[PDB]
Amino acid sequence: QVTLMESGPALVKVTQTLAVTCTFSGFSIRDSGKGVAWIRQPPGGALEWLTSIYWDDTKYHDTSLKPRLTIFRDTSQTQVILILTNMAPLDTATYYCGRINNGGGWKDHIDFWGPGLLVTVSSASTKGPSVFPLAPSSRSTSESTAALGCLVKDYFPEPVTVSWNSGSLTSGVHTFPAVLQSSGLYSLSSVVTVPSSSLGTQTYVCNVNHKPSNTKVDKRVE
Amino acid sequence: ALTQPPSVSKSLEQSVTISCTGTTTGNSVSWYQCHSGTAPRLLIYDVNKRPSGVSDRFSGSKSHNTASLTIFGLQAEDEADYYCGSYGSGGSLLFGGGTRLTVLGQPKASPTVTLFPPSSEELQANKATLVCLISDFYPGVVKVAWKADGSAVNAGVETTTPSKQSNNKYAASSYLSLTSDQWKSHKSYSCQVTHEGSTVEKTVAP
Amino acid sequence: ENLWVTVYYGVPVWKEAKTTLFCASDAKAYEKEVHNVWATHACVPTDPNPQEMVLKNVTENFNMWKNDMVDQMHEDVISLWDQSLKPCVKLTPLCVTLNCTNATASNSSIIEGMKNCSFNITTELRDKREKKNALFYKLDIVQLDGNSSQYRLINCNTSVITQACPKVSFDPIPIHYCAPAGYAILKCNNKTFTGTGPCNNVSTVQCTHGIKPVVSTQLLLNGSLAEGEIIIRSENITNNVKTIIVHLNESVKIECTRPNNKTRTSIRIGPGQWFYATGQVIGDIREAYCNINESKWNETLQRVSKKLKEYFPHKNITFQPSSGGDLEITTHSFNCGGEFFYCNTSSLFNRTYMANSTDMANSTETNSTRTITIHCRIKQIINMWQEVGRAMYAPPIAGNITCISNITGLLLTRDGGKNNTETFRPGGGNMKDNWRSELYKYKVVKIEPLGVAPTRCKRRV
Amino acid sequence: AVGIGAVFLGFLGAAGSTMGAASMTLTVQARNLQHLLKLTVWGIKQLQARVLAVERYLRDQQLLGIWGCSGKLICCTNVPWNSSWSNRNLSEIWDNMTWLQWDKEISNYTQIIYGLLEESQNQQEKNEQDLLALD
Numbered sequence A: 001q002v003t004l005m006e007s008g009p010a011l012v013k014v015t016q017t018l019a020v021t022c023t024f025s026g027f028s029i030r031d032s033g034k035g036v037a038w039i040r041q042p043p044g045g046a047l048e049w050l051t052s053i054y055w056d057d058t059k060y061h062d063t064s065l066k067p068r069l070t071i072f073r074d075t076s077q078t079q080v081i082l083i084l085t086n087m088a089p090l091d092t093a094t095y096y097c098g099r100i101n102n103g104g105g106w107k108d109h110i111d112f113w114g115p116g117l118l119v120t121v122s123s124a125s126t127k128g129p130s131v132f133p134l135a136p137s138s139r140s141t142s143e144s145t146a147a148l149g150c151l152v153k154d155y156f157p158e159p160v161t162v163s164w165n166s167g168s169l170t171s172g173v174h175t176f177p178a179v180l181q182s183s184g185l186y187s188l189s190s191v192v193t194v195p196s197s198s199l200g201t202q203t204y205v206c207n208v209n210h211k212p213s214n215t216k217v218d219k220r221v222e
Numbered sequence B: 001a002l003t004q005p006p007s008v009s010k011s012l013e014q015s016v017t018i019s020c021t022g023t024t025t026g027n028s029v030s031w032y033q034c035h036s037g038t039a040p041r042l043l044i045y046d047v048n049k050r051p052s053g054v055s056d057r058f059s060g061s062k063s064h065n066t067a068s069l070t071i072f073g074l075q076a077e078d079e080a081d082y083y084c085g086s087y088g089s090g091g092s093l094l095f096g097g098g099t100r101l102t103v104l105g106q107p108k109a110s111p112t113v114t115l116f117p118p119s120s121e122e123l124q125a126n127k128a129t130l131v132c133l134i135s136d137f138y139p140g141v142v143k144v145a146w147k148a149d150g151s152a153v154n155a156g157v158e159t160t161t162p163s164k165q166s167n168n169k170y171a172a173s174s175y176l177s178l179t180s181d182q183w184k185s186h187k188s189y190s191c192q193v194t195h196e197g198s199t200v201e202k203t204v205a206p
Numbered sequence C: 001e002n003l004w005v006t007v008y009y010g011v012p013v014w015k016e017a018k019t020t021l022f023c024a025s026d027a028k029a030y031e032k033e034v035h036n037v038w039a040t041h042a043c044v045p046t047d048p049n050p051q052e053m054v055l056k057n058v059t060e061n062f063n064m065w066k067n068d069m070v071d072q073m074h075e076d077v078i079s080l081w082d083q084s085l086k087p088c089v090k091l092t093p094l095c096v097t098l099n100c101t102n103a104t105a106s107n108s109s110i111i112e113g114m115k116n117c118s119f120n121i122t123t124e125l126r127d128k129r130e131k132k133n134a135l136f137y138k139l140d141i142v143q144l145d146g147n148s149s150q151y152r153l154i155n156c157n158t159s160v161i162t163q164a165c166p167k168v169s170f171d172p173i174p175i176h177y178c179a180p181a182g183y184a185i186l187k188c189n190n191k192t193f194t195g196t197g198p199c200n201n202v203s204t205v206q207c208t209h210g211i212k213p214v215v216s217t218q219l220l221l222n223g224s225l226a227e228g229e230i231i232i233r234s235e236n237i238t239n240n241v242k243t244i245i246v247h248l249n250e251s252v253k254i255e256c257t258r259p260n261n262k263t264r265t266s267i268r269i270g271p272g273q274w275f276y277a278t279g280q281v282i283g284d285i286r287e288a289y290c291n292i293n294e295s296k297w298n299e300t301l302q303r304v305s306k307k308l309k310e311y312f313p314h315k316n317i318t319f320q321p322s323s324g325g326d327l328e329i330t331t332h333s334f335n336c337g338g339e340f341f342y343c344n345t346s347s348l349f350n351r352t353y354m355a356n357s358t359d360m361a362n363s364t365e366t367n368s369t370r371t372i373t374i375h376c377r378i379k380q381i382i383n384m385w386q387e388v389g390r391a392m393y394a395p396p397i398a399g400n401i402t403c404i405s406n407i408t409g410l411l412l413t414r415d416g417g418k419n420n421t422e423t424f425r426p427g428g429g430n431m432k433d434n435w436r437s438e439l440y441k442y443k444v445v446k447i448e449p450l451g452v453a454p455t456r457c458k459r460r461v
Numbered sequence D: 001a002v003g004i005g006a007v008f009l010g011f012l013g014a015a016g017s018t019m020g021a022a023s024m025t026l027t028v029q030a031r032n033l034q035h036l037l038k039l040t041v042w043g044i045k046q047l048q049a050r051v052l053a054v055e056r057y058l059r060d061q062q063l064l065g066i067w068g069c070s071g072k073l074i075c076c077t078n079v080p081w082n083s084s085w086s087n088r089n090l091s092e093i094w095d096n097m098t099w100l101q102w103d104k105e106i107s108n109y110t111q112i113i114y115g116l117l118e119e120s121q122n123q124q125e126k127n128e129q130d131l132l133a134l135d
């Protein structure tokens, strides 16, 4: 096995409207308090449940937000969905859907949670990435003691991610959380372990991908 | 929301006790945790019931209103934020503010550090960036300093607060930025961590 | 040769089962003198008759930690406090200030911070409100405003602000639980009174004899005496520090009360509410001054080291005073129905014990008669029930009171138990574990009046 | 203890509509088996009914004993369905009528059928002496 996914837009504009979708293994089983939910967390904040739906379209709603939200599906299309009001940028968050399994009608299970969505809000639109290899001009190490990678810059918003020869050379990795580039953009670093003296007998590749532009690009580290 | 304490700190050998409070009914509170930047993880269910096949050190337990969570043998990796979750009126599912955990007596570890020079596609645009990477340290403390000759940090002070790795060690990065002529006219190209006051330095050269 | 099925009814069999049970109780401790009172409510008068038949040749499994009755009567009973949640007085739902330096009464008392005080920043800031005044001791002087503080009414900051006024009763009546029909209660007995695993002289009843409430942090009291020596109980006694309990031969006394007098000046406050503003300084010179017949304590520890030698071989062994935290963790606890109080188990209980071929060094003292005296604290503003957001400023009572007690057992924990001088402290445990006392005698079963077996008899067709 | 099927015994609710499925599954349709001082009165009055319902149930058990069907759930005896009873026919009852309809048909003959059972049972006892009266 069981896994969940959610997906939607990578950015929303200031006072526009979000919409999102959620699909899964575990397909529409009518099990032990079985349902699905939507949850969000403010930037670095606590968790917040929004809403959920069960083994028939019995469905339930937050008191404080109510008109701000609405929930349904086309059962045949096998996505759970969520639809919302127009947006104040504070509604930016880590958002997730999740699976429910509450017993005979009590006792909590949210027994699976999806990889989530980077729901992000600004008055501005998307901007695409610039990528740079980082290997230095002068060198002194020997053997597999070294590590190298690529910078990413000038994009907005996140996510961007990196892989090492389509996963095939993944070892001794470091990855750093991205930082706001002070013009109102973002920047990222990720690194992989390498032989200090044997670059070019094999090639080490930054496989960079950026969802908002859907830009995917491969560059040599050496 | 469900009220709980903000933060908990204890020795690495010690079986820590955590609690959160059910505002109503309470006797079905599940537990979950939040190691940061990532999807959360399931803990105890029903009441006291052990989740199937996840790490066995997290301790099934009960209370009537002060719903309670614990660890058996505490370990360094357990530094994370911990949450209560509840049924409530008509499917009003309720949730806590979190509680952070710190695992004292843990050694710490001195920074692993790396520095990289600016790139040709910056030099074509009169730009330059030095990329400083700070990693493998403990506790989650950092400050950072630079020596682009005698000059202060320029064109992006852009530096992370402390962040956790895959292991219970911590990391950050910094991006001192210049014009290409500032890069060519300077000659010292150096970054220094000052983590817990410890002097740790990297430098680049043509 | 072959076999076939047959069935029998009245077969002697039962199985262990979670259930509710219903309660017998004292026939006169409540009466028409106490209309609508919670002790008068629900469960029935007393049964004199509990018979038995013997389990000749026959034995059964027990586990006091596993048994559900702890929850059965942790539920029901605490609803006395739910019935006791009287509203806040009109003057004080908000965090009011109070002004004093010496007392508003004729003197501040002979012992500690009893510096009685008027409300001042008090809703309307008006004589009808600010004329009203409270008894002081300790938590009542907590800081509000700046230096030269107008002191904090601390009771405002928690989810329930209330008082259980003196009309409410807290008498520890003996309940006598009986199981529903077709259920039965089984009673374990042997000199090996361990209370988990197999039991030999197991016995049958329609109902238990009387067992009584208790409300202690560290020393259990005023109830079920042991069978003829001392014994220790634990879930898994091999454990490092998980809670331990000790049960006593001979009820050693606690010899004290805190008879400091304040007069019956209650007030029909505000919009026709009630409050207990007890004042004046007649009988003000008095303190808890607590005492114990030392030898009758000493005997327990000096035997107990031998008992512990069976569980932890040859090592030097130790008690230390109770663990830190709030005064409550720092102390043994009581209220007479008159004042809330907390004695210093965090000064007492400090003894080491030698355990080689020993003939020495196991006690406070030896060969003096003499007895001892001990000192103890009061807390007049209370988180009145642990593990809930409820708090009360306590209503006082005049003069000396008919109170004192004697001790049935210790609540205990093995703090520091990874090195020689093997260490322990008084305290620990759930608030529930008060009610472990005696209940190790029992378990509840459901009867199952039919069963099936093979036979040689082939049925008609 | 347990819920309710119209009554705490007899357990109407699996009405089945067609008598066919209902009869062909009749086994499972039971084989599945002042503060508070006025709680005296609010125990007394339903207690009376509860007891008198068991007494009703015992009236039924008495009739079942009288027909020689003690503890049975489906039962039969000697008596024929001798032609003049409505001719609705086996293959034309259960599949096209309901228990409530069947009563609304059959209500006339009730005491007569009961008497025919009584007589037949009482004869069936002594009829065995046609073989066993050896002394």
Ligand SMILES: *[C@@H]1O[C@H](CO)[C@@H](O[C@@H]2O[C@H](CO)[C@@H](O[C@@H]3O[C@H](CO)[C@@H](O[C@@H]4O[C@H](CO)[C@@H](O)[C@H](O)[C@H]4NC(C)=O)[C@H](O[C@H]4O[C@H](CO[C@H]5O[C@H](CO)[C@@H](O)[C@H](O)[C@@H]5O)[C@@H](O)[C@H](O)[C@@H]4O)[C@@H]3O)[C@H](O)[C@H]2NC(C)=O)[C@H](O)[C@H]1NC(C)=O
Binding pocket: A033, A054, A057, A058, A059, A060, A061, A104, A105, A106, B090, B091
């Ligand atoms: C013959 O005539 C009968 C009527 O006399 C018909 O029966 C009726 O059938 C309908 C469904 O077909 C049923 O509908 C009711 O609709 C309500 C309004 O939609 C619904 O109320 C909910 O209200 C909240 C308000 O905030 C909303 O958030 C909900 O979205 C809203 N709708 C729904 C669908 O939830 C009624 O809800 C029923 O179910 C809940 C269940 O909740 C409990 O179980 C959960 C299990 O996981 C547990 O988690 C929860 O904690 C709860 O314990 C109950 O709480 C409600 O009491 C209620 O039972 C409901 O859907 C009517 O109620 C039916 N009436 C009767 C008397 O049963 C019949 O179909 C007709 N047949 C024919 C052939 O004509």
Ligand SMILES: *[C@@H]1O[C@H](CO)[C@@H](O[C@@H]2O[C@H](CO)[C@@H](O[C@@H]3O[C@H](CO[C@H]4O[C@H](CO)[C@@H](O)[C@H](O)[C@@H]4O)[C@@H](O)[C@H](O[C@H]4O[C@H](CO)[C@@H](O)[C@H](O)[C@@H]4O)[C@@H]3O)[C@H](O)[C@H]2NC(C)=O)[C@H](O)[C@H]1NC(C)=O
Binding pocket: C228, C229, C230, C249, C303
């Ligand atoms: C809890 O409450 C009980 C009851 O109030 C207290 O008293 C118990 O009382 C009995 C009866 O007196 C005690 O048993 C007696 O012990 C004496 C000492 O035994 C040691 O020394 C002898 C030599 O004198 C050794 O042989 C023996 O191995 C021991 O090392 C004995 O002198 C007594 O002997 C008498 O009884 C026997 C047996 O029937 C007769 O044949 C003899 O003729 C003689 O008359 C007797 O055995 C008992 O020790 C007390 N119990 C305990 C456990 O102390 C408790 O003291 C009190 N406290 C505790 C901790 O239980």
Ligand SMILES: *[C@@H]1O[C@H](CO)[C@@H](O[C@@H]2O[C@H](CO)[C@@H](O[C@@H]3O[C@H](CO[C@H]4O[C@H](CO)[C@@H](O)[C@H](O)[C@@H]4O)[C@@H](O)[C@H](O[C@H]4O[C@H](CO)[C@@H](O)[C@H](O)[C@@H]4O)[C@@H]3O)[C@H](O)[C@H]2NC(C)=O)[C@H](O)[C@H]1NC(C)=O
Binding pocket: C221, C222, C336, C337, C338, C397, C401, C402, C403, C404, C405, C406
């Ligand atoms: C352990 O067990 C002992 C012994 O039973 C208990 O102490 C006894 O408690 C009863 C019940 O209160 C006392 O009997 C009656 O007390 C009334 C006074 O009530 C005050 O005291 C109680 C605490 O005991 C407070 O909660 C309450 O708020 C009051 O402040 C008296 O009015 C009664 O008077 C009658 O008896 C006296 C003689 O005793 C006569 O002079 C009178 O004319 C009248 O007939 C009565 O006294 C009893 O006195 C207490 N005895 C002792 C030795 O203290 C403990 O409470 C119990 N619990 C614990 C934890 O130890």
Ligand SMILES: *[C@@H]1O[C@H](CO)[C@@H](O[C@@H]2O[C@H](CO)[C@@H](O[C@@H]3O[C@H](CO)[C@@H](O[C@@H]4O[C@H](CO)[C@@H](O)[C@H](O)[C@H]4NC(C)=O)[C@H](O)[C@@H]3O)[C@H](O)[C@H]2NC(C)=O)[C@H](O)[C@H]1NC(C)=O
Binding pocket: C222, C225, C251, C252, C253, C405, C406
């Ligand atoms: C710790 O507190 C407990 C509970 O209050 C004390 O428990 C027991 O208290 C009694 C009375 O103080 C002690 O004395 C014996 O009591 C019995 C029962 O009253 C007496 O037996 C006979 O009882 C009837 C009815 O009461 C009476 O009519 C008879 O006259 C009377 N006597 C006879 C010969 O028939 C008996 O004589 C004693 O007076 C108990 O000893 C005590 N229980 C135990 C097991 O010791 C306990 O005393 C107290 N301990 C301390 C140190 O404070």
Ligand SMILES: *[C@@H]1O[C@H](CO)[C@@H](O[C@@H]2O[C@H](CO)[C@@H](O[C@@H]3O[C@H](CO)[C@@H](O)[C@H](O)[C@@H]3O)[C@H](O)[C@H]2NC(C)=O)[C@H](O)[C@H]1NC(C)=O
Binding pocket: C293, C294, C295, C369, C370, C371
């Ligand atoms: C603390 O408790 C001890 C032990 O009970 C008290 O000391 C001694 O107690 C015994 C009884 O246990 C007394 O014995 C009796 O003595 C009289 C003669 O006085 C005799 O007729 C009886 O047959 C019986 O033997 C003993 O006298 C007593 N000794 C002393 C010196 O007190 C002690 O008094 C208690 N102290 C307090 C303040 O509680």
Ligand SMILES: *[C@@H]1O[C@H](CO)[C@@H](O[C@@H]2O[C@H](CO)[C@@H](O[C@@H]3O[C@H](CO)[C@@H](O)[C@H](O)[C@@H]3O)[C@H](O)[C@H]2NC(C)=O)[C@H](O)[C@H]1NC(C)=O
Binding pocket: D106, D107, D108, D109
């Ligand atoms: C026994 O069955 C009958 C019929 O189902 C029940 O009703 C009674 O039936 C008779 C005969 O039909 C009625 O008498 C007369 O019948 C003719 C022809 O149908 C009609 O033209 C007359 O107007 C008259 O109805 C009789 O009136 C009717 N009774 C009632 C109250 O309507 C009878 O009740 C059943 N008895 C039992 C004990 O089951």
Ligand SMILES: *[C@@H]1O[C@H](CO)[C@@H](O[C@@H]2O[C@H](CO)[C@@H](O)[C@H](O)[C@H]2NC(C)=O)[C@H](O)[C@H]1NC(C)=O
Binding pocket: C321, C322, C323, C324, C327, C330, C344, C346, C347, C348, C377
């Ligand atoms: C008398 O009571 C006080 C509380 O009023 C005890 O307070 C603390 O208790 C712990 C456990 O014993 C100690 O670690 C602390 O050092 C104590 N603090 C203070 C300020 O005393 C106290 O222990 C008791 N008195 C003595 C002499 O032990």
Ligand SMILES: *[C@@H]1O[C@H](CO)[C@@H](O)[C@H](O)[C@H]1NC(C)=O
Binding pocket: D081, D082, D083, D084, D085
């Ligand atoms: C059965 O026989 C009797 C006479 O013995 C007759 O009156 C009746 O109509 C017949 N049929 C039924 C079904 O009773």
